[PDB]
Amino acid sequence: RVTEQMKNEADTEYYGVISIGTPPESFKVIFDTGSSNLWVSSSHCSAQACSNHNKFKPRQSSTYVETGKTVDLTYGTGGMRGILGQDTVSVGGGSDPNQELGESQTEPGPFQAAAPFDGILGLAYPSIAAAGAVPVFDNMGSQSLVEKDLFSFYLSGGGANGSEVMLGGVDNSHYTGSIHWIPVTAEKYWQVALDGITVNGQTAACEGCQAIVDTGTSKIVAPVSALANIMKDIGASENQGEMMGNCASVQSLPDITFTINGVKQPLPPSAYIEGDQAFCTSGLGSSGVPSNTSELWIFGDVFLRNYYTIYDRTNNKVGFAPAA
Numbered sequence: 001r002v003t004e005q006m007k008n009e010a011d012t013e014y015y016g017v018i019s020i021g022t023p024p025e026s027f028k029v030i031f032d033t034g035s036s037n038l039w040v041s042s043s044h045c046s047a048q049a050c051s052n053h054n055k056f057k058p059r060q061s062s063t064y065v066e067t068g069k070t071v072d073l074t075y076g077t078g079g080m081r082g083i084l085g086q087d088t089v090s091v092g093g094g095s096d097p098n099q100e101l102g103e104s105q106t107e108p109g110p111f112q113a114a115a116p117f118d119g120i121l122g123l124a125y126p127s128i129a130a131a132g133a134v135p136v137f138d139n140m141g142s143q144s145l146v147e148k149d150l151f152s153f154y155l156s157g158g159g160a161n162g163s164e165v166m167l168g169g170v171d172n173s174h175y176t177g178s179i180h181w182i183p184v185t186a187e188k189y190w191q192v193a194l195d196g197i198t199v200n201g202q203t204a205a206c207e208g209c210q211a212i213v214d215t216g217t218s219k220i221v222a223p224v225s226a227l228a229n230i231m232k233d234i235g236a237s238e239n240q241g242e243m244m245g246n247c248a249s250v251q252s253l254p255d256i257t258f259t260i261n262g263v264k265q266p267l268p269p270s271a272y273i274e275g276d277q278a279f280c281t282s283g284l285g286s287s288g289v290p291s292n293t294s295e296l297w298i299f300g301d302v303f304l305r306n307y308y309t310i311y312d313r314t315n316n317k318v319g320f321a322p323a324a
Contacts, residue, residue, distance in 0.1 A: 001146050001168035002093045006031060007116075008159050011274070011301060012218040015117040016165060019090040020101060021061030027054055029121040031153070031165050033190050033311065034214035034298075036129040037073055038089070038136055039082050040119035042103030049112035056103055056118075063088045063097070071102050073130035076289055078112070078120070081105040084133065091121070091136065092167045095145055100134050123151065123215075123311070125187045140167070141313065152310040153215060154323065155301060175308035175321030182261040183317040185210055186292075190311055190318055194297060196259035197226075199233055210296045211258070212289070213309065213318050217300025220272060221287045224295065230256070234269070236282040243282040247275055258297075265320060271306045 006016025007028075015030045020040065027040050041053035058064045069084040082102040089099035104119070122128075122135055129135055140146050146168025154174040156162040164171060170179075185193045194209035205226040222230055234253050236243035245253075253269035274283050283302050287295060310319040 003164050003166035003169065003171055004092045005161065006163050006165050008156050008161065008163050009116050010159050011155075011157060011305070013116055014153075014155055014163050014215055014301070016163075018121060020056060020087050020099075022063035022088060023061075024090065025054075025056055025061065027056065027118045028116065029119045030115075030117040030216060031123065032120055032214075032216040033123045033153075034212055034216040035075060035120060035122035036124040036126060036135040037071070037102055037120065037122045037131075037133050038100070039071075039073070039080070039102030039104055041107065042083075042105075044083060045104045045107055047106045047108055047112075049107040049109075049115075050104060052113060053107075053118040056101075058085060058087075058103065061087050065098075067100070069131065070105070071131040071133065073102070075120075078109055080107040080109075080112070084131070089136065092165065096136070096139055096143065099136065099139060102133060120216075124189050127188050137313065149314045150310060150312050152308065153304060154308050155215070155305045157305050170310055171308075174324055176324045177322050179310065179319040179321045180261065180263050180265065181317050181319045183315075187316065188292075189214065192260060192318055194258050194260055195262070196264070198257040198259065198264060199230070199254045201255075201257070204229065204233075206259075208294050210291065210293060211299050212296065213299050213304075213311075215301070215304060217298050218302075219283055219285050219298070219300040220267070220302040221285050221298035221300065223287050223297065227284075227286045230284065231282075234273075234282065236284075239281075243284070245273075245280055245282060247278065247280040250275070250280060260320075265307070267303065267306060272302055 065086040067084040071082040154164040189212035197205040256267040307320040
Protein backbone atom coordinates (compact mmCIF):
# COMPACT_ATOMS: atom_id res chain seq x y z
CA ARG A 1 0.00 0.00 0.00
CA VAL A 2 2.59 2.91 0.31
CA THR A 3 5.91 4.13 1.64
CA GLU A 4 7.50 7.30 2.66
CA GLN A 5 10.91 8.83 3.06
CA MET A 6 11.54 9.50 6.81
CA LYS A 7 14.37 11.45 8.42
CA ASN A 8 17.80 10.55 9.85
CA GLU A 9 19.40 12.64 12.60
CA ALA A 10 23.08 11.72 12.57
CA ASP A 11 22.43 7.93 12.22
CA THR A 12 21.06 7.99 15.77
CA GLU A 13 17.50 8.93 15.31
CA TYR A 14 15.19 7.85 12.46
CA TYR A 15 11.97 9.78 12.75
CA GLY A 16 9.24 10.73 10.32
CA VAL A 17 5.70 12.00 9.91
CA ILE A 18 2.15 11.15 11.00
CA SER A 19 -1.07 13.31 11.29
CA ILE A 20 -3.67 13.28 14.05
CA GLY A 21 -7.04 15.06 14.28
CA THR A 22 -9.75 16.44 11.87
CA PRO A 23 -8.41 18.69 10.31
CA PRO A 24 -4.96 17.13 10.74
CA GLU A 25 -2.21 18.35 13.14
CA SER A 26 1.20 16.90 11.84
CA PHE A 27 3.92 15.44 14.11
CA LYS A 28 7.40 13.95 13.79
CA VAL A 29 7.44 10.61 15.61
CA ILE A 30 10.26 8.13 16.15
CA PHE A 31 9.36 4.92 14.33
CA ASP A 32 10.08 2.40 17.13
CA THR A 33 10.14 -1.39 16.72
CA GLY A 34 11.29 -1.78 20.33
CA SER A 35 8.16 -0.35 21.87
CA SER A 36 4.39 -0.59 21.16
CA ASN A 37 2.85 2.68 22.52
CA LEU A 38 1.74 5.82 20.59
CA TRP A 39 2.01 9.21 22.31
CA VAL A 40 2.54 12.86 21.28
CA SER A 41 3.40 16.10 23.13
CA SER A 42 -0.12 17.43 24.02
CA SER A 43 -1.49 20.73 25.25
CA HIS A 44 -2.05 19.08 28.72
CA CYS A 45 1.67 19.19 29.10
CA SER A 46 3.71 22.05 30.41
CA ALA A 47 7.06 20.39 31.38
CA GLN A 48 9.99 22.13 29.51
CA ALA A 49 10.36 19.27 26.97
CA CYS A 50 6.71 19.71 26.10
CA SER A 51 7.30 23.48 25.69
CA ASN A 52 9.69 23.12 22.72
CA HIS A 53 7.82 20.29 20.96
CA ASN A 54 4.79 20.44 18.67
CA LYS A 55 1.79 20.07 20.94
CA PHE A 56 -1.36 18.16 20.08
CA LYS A 57 -4.54 20.14 20.94
CA PRO A 58 -7.64 17.96 21.41
CA ARG A 59 -10.16 20.84 21.25
CA GLN A 60 -9.24 21.55 17.65
CA SER A 61 -10.04 18.08 16.30
CA SER A 62 -13.70 17.37 15.62
CA THR A 63 -12.98 13.66 15.63
CA TYR A 64 -11.47 13.51 19.18
CA VAL A 65 -12.97 11.39 21.91
CA GLU A 66 -11.32 11.40 25.38
CA THR A 67 -10.74 8.41 27.86
CA GLY A 68 -9.60 9.51 31.36
CA LYS A 69 -7.18 6.59 31.66
CA THR A 70 -3.76 7.82 32.53
CA VAL A 71 -0.59 5.97 31.56
CA ASP A 72 2.77 5.96 33.34
CA LEU A 73 5.17 4.84 30.80
CA THR A 74 8.67 4.55 31.72
CA TYR A 75 10.29 3.40 28.45
CA GLY A 76 13.49 1.80 29.75
CA THR A 77 14.03 5.37 30.83
CA GLY A 78 11.94 7.60 28.97
CA GLY A 79 9.58 7.88 31.98
CA MET A 80 6.69 10.13 31.28
CA ARG A 81 3.10 10.68 32.07
CA GLY A 82 0.02 10.62 29.89
CA ILE A 83 -3.76 10.46 29.36
CA LEU A 84 -5.52 8.19 26.88
CA GLY A 85 -7.81 9.44 24.10
CA GLN A 86 -9.11 8.49 20.64
CA ASP A 87 -8.82 10.26 17.25
CA THR A 88 -8.08 9.43 13.59
CA VAL A 89 -4.32 8.81 12.90
CA SER A 90 -2.76 8.83 9.40
CA VAL A 91 0.65 7.28 8.61
CA GLY A 92 2.20 7.03 5.11
CA GLY A 93 -1.27 7.98 3.71
CA GLY A 94 -4.91 8.20 4.30
CA SER A 95 -5.88 5.69 7.05
CA ASP A 96 -6.93 5.08 10.80
CA PRO A 97 -10.06 6.07 12.61
CA ASN A 98 -10.75 5.58 16.34
CA GLN A 99 -7.02 5.22 16.98
CA GLU A 100 -6.08 5.30 20.65
CA LEU A 101 -3.40 7.92 21.39
CA GLY A 102 -1.59 8.92 24.60
CA GLU A 103 -1.48 12.70 25.12
CA SER A 104 1.47 13.62 27.38
CA GLN A 105 1.04 15.30 30.72
CA THR A 106 4.69 15.51 31.91
CA GLU A 107 7.66 14.65 29.74
CA PRO A 108 11.24 14.85 31.12
CA GLY A 109 14.59 13.07 30.63
CA PRO A 110 17.73 14.78 29.34
CA PHE A 111 16.49 13.75 25.93
CA GLN A 112 12.74 14.64 25.58
CA ALA A 113 13.68 18.46 25.36
CA ALA A 114 16.38 18.05 22.69
CA ALA A 115 14.97 14.85 21.05
CA PRO A 116 13.91 15.76 17.47
CA PHE A 117 10.58 13.93 17.37
CA ASP A 118 7.38 15.16 19.17
CA GLY A 119 6.35 11.65 20.23
CA ILE A 120 6.84 7.96 19.67
CA LEU A 121 4.90 5.55 17.41
CA GLY A 122 5.52 1.99 18.69
CA LEU A 123 5.65 -0.91 16.32
CA ALA A 124 6.30 -3.91 18.71
CA TYR A 125 3.49 -6.26 19.93
CA PRO A 126 0.34 -5.52 22.06
CA SER A 127 1.95 -7.34 24.97
CA ILE A 128 4.51 -4.64 25.60
CA ALA A 129 2.00 -1.71 25.22
CA ALA A 130 2.09 0.11 28.52
CA ALA A 131 -1.51 0.40 29.90
CA GLY A 132 -3.00 -1.74 27.06
CA ALA A 133 -2.89 0.89 24.36
CA VAL A 134 -3.71 -0.66 20.97
CA PRO A 135 -0.58 -0.31 18.77
CA VAL A 136 -1.16 1.46 15.40
CA PHE A 137 -0.22 -1.43 13.20
CA ASP A 138 -2.55 -3.82 15.02
CA ASN A 139 -5.44 -1.55 13.96
CA MET A 140 -4.49 -1.24 10.23
CA GLY A 141 -4.42 -5.02 10.73
CA SER A 142 -7.85 -5.50 12.26
CA GLN A 143 -9.39 -2.91 9.93
CA SER A 144 -7.87 -4.72 6.96
CA LEU A 145 -6.17 -1.59 5.62
CA VAL A 146 -2.99 -3.04 4.17
CA GLU A 147 -2.51 -5.36 1.06
CA LYS A 148 -0.16 -7.47 3.10
CA ASP A 149 0.34 -7.21 6.92
CA LEU A 150 3.96 -6.14 6.74
CA PHE A 151 6.06 -2.98 7.17
CA SER A 152 9.79 -2.69 6.33
CA PHE A 153 12.63 -0.38 6.96
CA TYR A 154 15.49 0.96 4.93
CA LEU A 155 17.90 3.18 7.04
CA SER A 156 20.53 5.52 5.39
CA GLY A 157 24.13 6.03 6.42
CA GLY A 158 26.26 9.11 7.22
CA GLY A 159 22.91 10.86 7.77
CA ALA A 160 22.07 11.00 4.13
CA ASN A 161 18.43 11.18 3.22
CA GLY A 162 16.84 8.09 1.77
CA SER A 163 15.47 6.30 4.86
CA GLU A 164 12.06 4.73 4.16
CA VAL A 165 9.24 2.99 6.08
CA MET A 166 7.18 0.79 3.72
CA LEU A 167 3.74 -0.34 5.12
CA GLY A 168 1.81 -3.31 3.61
CA GLY A 169 4.59 -3.73 0.89
CA VAL A 170 8.46 -4.27 0.74
CA ASP A 171 10.52 -1.91 -1.47
CA ASN A 172 12.41 -4.04 -3.92
CA SER A 173 14.82 -1.30 -4.98
CA HIS A 174 16.29 -1.45 -1.43
CA TYR A 175 17.96 -4.76 -1.03
CA THR A 176 20.17 -7.14 -2.96
CA GLY A 177 20.25 -10.93 -2.80
CA SER A 178 17.60 -12.94 -1.06
CA ILE A 179 15.29 -12.36 1.86
CA HIS A 180 16.59 -14.34 4.84
CA TRP A 181 13.68 -15.25 7.13
CA ILE A 182 13.62 -16.19 10.85
CA PRO A 183 10.62 -16.43 13.08
CA VAL A 184 9.70 -14.45 16.07
CA THR A 185 10.71 -16.45 19.18
CA ALA A 186 8.50 -14.17 21.33
CA GLU A 187 5.74 -11.79 20.50
CA LYS A 188 6.86 -9.02 22.87
CA TYR A 189 9.54 -7.08 21.02
CA TRP A 190 10.41 -8.32 17.59
CA GLN A 191 12.62 -11.00 19.12
CA VAL A 192 14.57 -13.57 16.96
CA ALA A 193 17.02 -16.33 17.92
CA LEU A 194 20.71 -16.43 17.12
CA ASP A 195 22.31 -19.75 16.53
CA GLY A 196 25.86 -18.54 16.82
CA ILE A 197 28.34 -15.73 16.87
CA THR A 198 31.40 -15.88 14.68
CA VAL A 199 34.33 -13.42 14.39
CA ASN A 200 36.20 -13.96 11.02
CA GLY A 201 34.29 -17.16 10.16
CA GLN A 202 35.01 -18.54 13.66
CA THR A 203 32.88 -19.01 16.84
CA ALA A 204 32.86 -16.63 19.86
CA ALA A 205 29.80 -16.53 22.24
CA CYS A 206 26.41 -18.27 21.55
CA GLU A 207 22.92 -22.11 21.05
CA GLY A 208 20.77 -19.57 22.79
CA CYS A 209 21.06 -15.93 22.05
CA GLN A 210 17.94 -13.90 21.40
CA ALA A 211 18.14 -10.52 19.65
CA ILE A 212 15.50 -7.80 19.81
CA VAL A 213 15.33 -6.04 16.35
CA ASP A 214 15.01 -2.41 17.44
CA THR A 215 14.98 0.78 15.30
CA GLY A 216 14.79 2.73 18.55
CA THR A 217 18.38 1.66 19.48
CA SER A 218 21.22 3.37 17.63
CA LYS A 219 23.66 0.64 18.48
CA ILE A 220 24.35 -3.17 18.27
CA VAL A 221 24.40 -4.28 21.91
CA ALA A 222 25.94 -7.49 23.24
CA PRO A 223 25.40 -9.61 26.33
CA VAL A 224 27.08 -8.02 29.40
CA SER A 225 29.76 -10.74 29.84
CA ALA A 226 30.77 -11.31 26.24
CA LEU A 227 31.03 -7.52 25.48
CA ALA A 228 34.61 -7.78 26.70
CA ASN A 229 36.02 -10.54 24.38
CA ILE A 230 34.55 -8.70 21.41
CA MET A 231 36.27 -5.52 22.70
CA LYS A 232 39.46 -7.51 23.06
CA ASP A 233 38.97 -8.57 19.43
CA ILE A 234 38.95 -5.33 17.39
CA GLY A 235 41.34 -3.65 19.79
CA ALA A 236 38.95 -1.03 21.12
CA SER A 237 40.04 0.63 24.47
CA GLU A 238 38.07 3.05 26.73
CA ASN A 239 38.70 6.63 25.55
CA GLN A 240 34.51 10.58 26.81
CA GLY A 241 34.02 6.89 27.56
CA GLU A 242 33.69 5.62 24.01
CA MET A 243 35.56 2.52 22.88
CA MET A 244 37.71 3.89 20.12
CA GLY A 245 40.52 2.35 18.15
CA ASN A 246 43.04 3.61 15.65
CA CYS A 247 41.71 4.34 12.17
CA ALA A 248 44.68 3.03 10.05
CA SER A 249 43.84 -0.47 11.60
CA VAL A 250 40.27 -0.67 10.25
CA GLN A 251 40.36 -2.57 6.92
CA SER A 252 42.10 -5.40 8.71
CA LEU A 253 39.59 -5.49 11.62
CA PRO A 254 37.29 -8.53 12.13
CA ASP A 255 34.02 -9.38 10.43
CA ILE A 256 31.31 -10.35 12.97
CA THR A 257 28.55 -12.73 11.72
CA PHE A 258 25.43 -14.09 13.35
CA THR A 259 24.07 -17.46 12.53
CA ILE A 260 20.29 -16.93 12.25
CA ASN A 261 18.29 -19.93 10.79
CA GLY A 262 21.35 -21.70 9.23
CA VAL A 263 22.64 -18.55 7.50
CA LYS A 264 25.59 -16.67 8.91
CA GLN A 265 25.12 -12.97 8.15
CA PRO A 266 28.11 -10.68 8.24
CA LEU A 267 28.63 -7.35 9.84
CA PRO A 268 31.83 -5.62 8.55
CA PRO A 269 33.92 -3.08 10.51
CA SER A 270 32.71 -0.49 8.01
CA ALA A 271 29.37 -1.05 9.58
CA TYR A 272 30.15 -1.27 13.34
CA ILE A 273 32.75 1.49 13.30
CA GLU A 274 31.87 5.13 13.01
CA GLY A 275 34.67 7.11 11.48
CA ASP A 276 33.58 10.60 12.24
CA GLN A 277 36.94 12.09 11.19
CA ALA A 278 40.34 10.90 12.28
CA PHE A 279 38.41 9.32 15.10
CA CYS A 280 36.98 5.83 14.89
CA THR A 281 34.52 4.96 17.56
CA SER A 282 33.25 1.44 18.15
CA GLY A 283 29.46 1.62 17.80
CA LEU A 284 28.93 -1.60 19.97
CA GLY A 285 27.79 -1.53 23.57
CA SER A 286 26.65 -3.67 26.50
CA SER A 287 23.10 -5.17 26.61
CA GLY A 288 20.96 -3.11 29.01
CA VAL A 289 17.43 -4.62 28.96
CA PRO A 290 16.84 -7.71 31.16
CA SER A 291 16.54 -11.10 29.43
CA ASN A 292 13.35 -12.93 30.44
CA THR A 293 15.22 -16.13 29.30
CA SER A 294 19.06 -15.95 28.68
CA GLU A 295 21.08 -12.85 27.53
CA LEU A 296 20.18 -10.98 24.57
CA TRP A 297 21.67 -8.88 21.86
CA ILE A 298 19.86 -5.68 20.68
CA PHE A 299 20.19 -5.18 16.89
CA GLY A 300 19.84 -1.43 16.77
CA ASP A 301 20.67 0.92 13.93
CA VAL A 302 24.13 -0.54 13.16
CA PHE A 303 22.60 -3.90 11.94
CA LEU A 304 19.56 -2.20 10.35
CA ARG A 305 21.72 0.11 8.24
CA ASN A 306 23.49 -3.05 6.90
CA TYR A 307 20.26 -5.10 6.51
CA TYR A 308 16.95 -3.93 4.92
CA THR A 309 14.37 -5.30 7.51
CA ILE A 310 10.89 -6.81 6.90
CA TYR A 311 8.53 -7.30 9.89
CA ASP A 312 5.87 -9.97 9.19
CA ARG A 313 2.80 -10.06 11.44
CA THR A 314 0.71 -12.57 9.59
CA ASN A 315 3.53 -15.11 9.73
CA ASN A 316 5.38 -13.91 12.84
CA LYS A 317 8.83 -13.57 11.35
CA VAL A 318 11.44 -10.92 10.50
CA GLY A 319 13.47 -11.04 7.32
CA PHE A 320 16.86 -9.59 6.42
CA ALA A 321 18.25 -8.87 2.99
CA PRO A 322 21.47 -6.96 2.34
CA ALA A 323 20.77 -3.22 2.12
CA ALA A 324 21.42 -1.45 -1.20
